[PDB]
Amino acid sequence: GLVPRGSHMKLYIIGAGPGDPDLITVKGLKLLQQADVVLYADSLVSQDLIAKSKPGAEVLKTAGMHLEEMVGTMLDRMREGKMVVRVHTGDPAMYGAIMEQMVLLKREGVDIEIVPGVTSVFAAAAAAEAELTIPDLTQTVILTRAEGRTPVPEFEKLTDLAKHKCTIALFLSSTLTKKVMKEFINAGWSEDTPVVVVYKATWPDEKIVRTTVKDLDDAMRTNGIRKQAMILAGWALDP
Amino acid sequence: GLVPRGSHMKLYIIGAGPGDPDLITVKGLKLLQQADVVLYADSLVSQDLIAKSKPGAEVLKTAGMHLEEMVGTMLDRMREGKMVVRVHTGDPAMYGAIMEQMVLLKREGVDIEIVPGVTSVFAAAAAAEAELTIPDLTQTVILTRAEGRTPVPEFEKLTDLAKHKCTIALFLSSTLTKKVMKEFINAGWSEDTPVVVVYKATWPDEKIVRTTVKDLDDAMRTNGIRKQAMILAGWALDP
Ligand SMILES: Nc1ncnc2c1ncn2[C@@H]1O[C@H](CSCC[C@H](N)C(=O)O)[C@@H](O)[C@H]1O
Ligand SMILES: Nc1ncnc2c1ncn2[C@@H]1O[C@H](CSCC[C@H](N)C(=O)O)[C@@H](O)[C@H]1O
Numbered sequence: 001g002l003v004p005r006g007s008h009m010k011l012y013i014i015g016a017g018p019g020d021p022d023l024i025t026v027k028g029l030k031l032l033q034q035a036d037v038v039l040y041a042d043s044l045v046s047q048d049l050i051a052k053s054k055p056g057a058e059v060l061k062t063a064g065m066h067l068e069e070m071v072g073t074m075l076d077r078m079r080e081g082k083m084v085v086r087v088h089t090g091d092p093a094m095y096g097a098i099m100e101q102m103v104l105l106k107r108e109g110v111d112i113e114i115v116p117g118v119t120s121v122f123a124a125a126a127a128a129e130a131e132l133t134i135p136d137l138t139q140t141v142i143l144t145r146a147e148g149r150t151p152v153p154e155f156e157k158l159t160d161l162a163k164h165k166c167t168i169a170l171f172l173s174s175t176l177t178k179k180v181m182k183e184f185i186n187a188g189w190s191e192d193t194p195v196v197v198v199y200k201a202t203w204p205d206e207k208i209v210r211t212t213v214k215d216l217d218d219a220m221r222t223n224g225i226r227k228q229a230m231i232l233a234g235w236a237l238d239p
Numbered sequence: 240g241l242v243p244r245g246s247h248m249k250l251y252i253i254g255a256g257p258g259d260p261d262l263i264t265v266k267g268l269k270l271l272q273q274a275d276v277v278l279y280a281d282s283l284v285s286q287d288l289i290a291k292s293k294p295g296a297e298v299l300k301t302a303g304m305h306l307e308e309m310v311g312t313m314l315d316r317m318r319e320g321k322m323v324v325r326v327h328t329g330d331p332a333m334y335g336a337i338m339e340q341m342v343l344l345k346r347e348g349v350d351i352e353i354v355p356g357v358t359s360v361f362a363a364a365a366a367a368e369a370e371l372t373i374p375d376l377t378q379t380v381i382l383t384r385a386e387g388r389t390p391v392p393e394f395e396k397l398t399d400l401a402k403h404k405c406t407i408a409l410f411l412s413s414t415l416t417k418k419v420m421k422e423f424i425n426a427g428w429s430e431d432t433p434v435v436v437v438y439k440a441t442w443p444d445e446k447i448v449r450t451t452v453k454d455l456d457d458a459m460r461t462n463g464i465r466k467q468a469m470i471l472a473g474w475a476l477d478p
Contacts, residue, residue, distance in 0.1 A: 015361070017264065025357060026268055027261035091357070093364040093371045094380065102368065114365035116329070116357045118264060122254070125332040126353035129341065131384075132332045139391045140383040140400060141333065144372075152378045155403045162380060164394045 009110050012197035013098050015117015016040075020202035021049040023123065028087075030114045036162040039074070046203070050191075062086075071104045078110060085088075091119040094143060094170055104214050108220050121169040124198035124218040124230035127208055134168045134236050140166035146176035146183070150220035165189070167234035174199075174229035177217040184213045184233065199225040210239060243407075247317050248349050252337050253393040254356015255279075259441035260288040262362065267326075267354045270331045275316065275321040278313070283328050283467075285442070301325075310343045330358040332408055333382060340383040360408040363437035363469035371406045373475050379405035385415035385422070388430060397422035404428070408475035413438075413468035431438055433476035436463040449478060 003006075010030050017023030024032070031067035032038065032052055040050060040058045054069050055170060058077070062093055067184060077084050088096045102112050121143060125132055132141045142161050145152065152158075162168060162184050174197075185191060191214035199207045213233070218225075240246075250271050256262030263271070271277065271291055277298045292298060297316070301309050314321050321451055327335045341351050352389060362383060364371055371380045381400050384391065391397075401407060401423050412419060413436075424430060430453035440444045450458035452472070459465075 015357070015365075018355070020266070022266035022269070023355065025256065025262050025263050028246055028257070029265055030261070091361040091364075093361050093369065094370045094402075095378075096370055099370050099373065112368055114368060116257070116262065116361040116365040118254070118355045118357060119361060122330040122358060123357040124334050125330075126254075126355040129353060130332065131335055131338050133334045134338065137392070138395065139334075140381060140395045142379060142381050144379040151375070153405070156377065156379045156405055161403060164400060166383075166392070166395055229370055 002056040006030055008083065009083045010078070010084070011074060011101070011105055011110055013081065013086055013096070013112060013114045014087050014089040014090050015043050015115055016049055016087045016089055017118040018120045018123035019046050019200060019201045021052065022204055023047060025115060025117060025120045028117060031085055031115065034083060037077045039085070040085060040087040045087050050087065050230070064077060067100055067104070071101055074101070074105065075108055075110070075156050089120070091117045093231055094119055094121070118172070120201055120230045123201040124196070124232055127198050127201050128196045128232060128237065129204065130196065130237050131231065132232070132236050138166040138234060138236055141165060142166060142168045142231045143171065144153070145171045146173035146180050148176050148179070155239065159187045162187035162189060166233065167236045170231040170233070174220065174225055174227055177220045180231070181213055181216050189213060191204040192239070193233065194235060196232045196237045197225060197229050198225070198232070242414045243419055247320045247322065248324070250313060250334070250340070250344055250349055250351050252351060252353045253324055253326050254354055255284050255288055255326045255328055257359045257441045258285050258355040258439060259364035260284050260285055260291065262357045262365055262441055263288060264354060264356060270354065273322060274322040274324040276316045276380055277326060278309070278324070279326040280328070281431040285325050285411040291324065306339055306343070306417070310340055312326065312451070313340070313344065313346055314349070328359070330356045333358055334384070359410070360468045363435070363471055366437050366440050367435045367444065367471060367476065369435065369471065369476050371475050373469070377405040377473060377475055379403060380403060381407045382410065383407065384410045384414035385419050387415050387418070393453060401426035401428060406471065406475045409470040409472070412470055413459065413464055416459045419470070420452055420455050428452060431474065433474060433478070435471045435476045436464060436466045436468050437471070438462070440469060
């Protein structure tokens with residue numbers, strides 16, 4: 001491009017997708033292939049996607065890094081004229097923890113561009129061959145998380161949310177299935193209501209488990225699923 | 240590939256994304272480029288995405304086609320040994336109306352593969368630079384539609400859903416903003432609660448409107464948005 005526009009002062013926040021390297025958007029892949037600096041969280045974002053960055057890119061893992069340092073590193077590379085990008089699992093809007101870095105960067109005059117991606121809810125619906133909305137059955141899909149030690153807001157408890165009897169998709173809840181069950185049975189759900197668990201959707205080790213509220217905790221333990229699972233609950237998951 | 244596996248007896252149900260041709264997944268684009276037969280719904284799925292199909296592909300519009308005919312055409316092409324694919328807006332799980340064709344096709348022994356895509360909810364969150372989940376504010380995102388003449392299930396009315404005070408994302412509701420407002424104010428929401436409307440997210444004519452419950456219907460009419468809008472309501476949309 002011919003003329004300087006201060007385009008290094010930008011962060012691209014790219015929705016990698018659920019894990020298969022080909023479920024990134026075409027646009028996210030173009031940016032990932034041009035970036036000079038690639039930030040991401042190990043074993044959640046596939047290594048085969050991150051290896052698509054160009055020879056010479058600086059690839060940084062952010063897990064063991066505090067907020068101000070990560071941000072300070074991003075700005076240093078930006079101010080050296082580098083194209084900097086941060087790759088997030090699924091779509092960043094769902095528990096991507098992007099707001100804190102955005103607020104600090106915009107105060108330093110950085111532009112943000114978020115590139116939307118395939119969220120794991122939808123990757124799991126697809127793998128399960130389910131549409132989450134069924135005319136005359138349910139027209140609402142509730143994205144949430146079960147409460148473990150970190151409480152959820154007062155008006156968002158799983159039981160209250162489950163009184164709507166629609167489709168419920170649980171993030172960050174694979175080791176909270178006893179709590180999920182209790183919450184569903186206290187809302188009045190049948191213990192036979194369908195629950196589909198998709199562990200690592202789209203990865204080579206994906207597992208699809210079909211079960212019900214009553215066997216949820218046993219199907220989790222029996223199948224060894226203790227992380228990275230998307231739980232789809234409702235009559236739209238009836239096979 | 241060396242040996243016959245009955246691989247023509249398959250339907251790929253591909254999540255095109257919100258509209259920009261580059262927000263299709265890399266995988267959906269590969270399938271779209273190989274397909275012999277491409278089915279889709281005009282002006283909702285961009286022409287520039289559908290033009291990526293290969294020279295010679297048969298491109299069929301399905302709007303003016305009944306269920307059994309579309310299905311009967313899909314099977315005829317399958318049984319001639321053709322690779323057949325159907326391209327749906329956003330992600331097919333959200334009001335993609337895929338279940339009816341799946342049930343009829345599986346009875347004829349067809350395999351289904353759904354390729355998840357970027358739903359318009361997430362395309363609109365990105366355009367608005369918003370994360371929909373904020374620790375200590377909201378951990379739940381409710382995907383639904385306002386009720387016009389086609390009623391929603393009894394336990395899924397907008398007001399009841401809005402008592403959770405979380406993020407609410409309305410599909411198919413751009414000309415129902417008076418009903419949405421009433422439903423939000425009856426649930427007790429402040430009339431100042433942020434509402435972001437993204438009309439045609441990612442298309443060349445995208446418009447981002449920032450407003451509140453109280454000015455929702457006027458901001459829609461004033462901006463001329465009467466279709467293809469994604470309404471994100473909640474304190475997570477506070478700019
Ligand atoms: N490939 C995958 N399969 C199943 N669940 C997944 C997943 N990737 C992420 N998750 C879900 O996401 C949680 C992490 S929170 C990050 C979610 C991501 N923003 C997205 O849109 O998918 C996990 O606990 C699990 O609930
Ligand atoms: N590009 C876009 N911008 C805004 N809303 C859009 C959109 N594409 C589809 N929609 C939303 O989707 C509705 C059609 S129902 C089909 C939705 C699609 N399955 C998806 O996941 O996005 C529209 O009324 C509008 O609410």
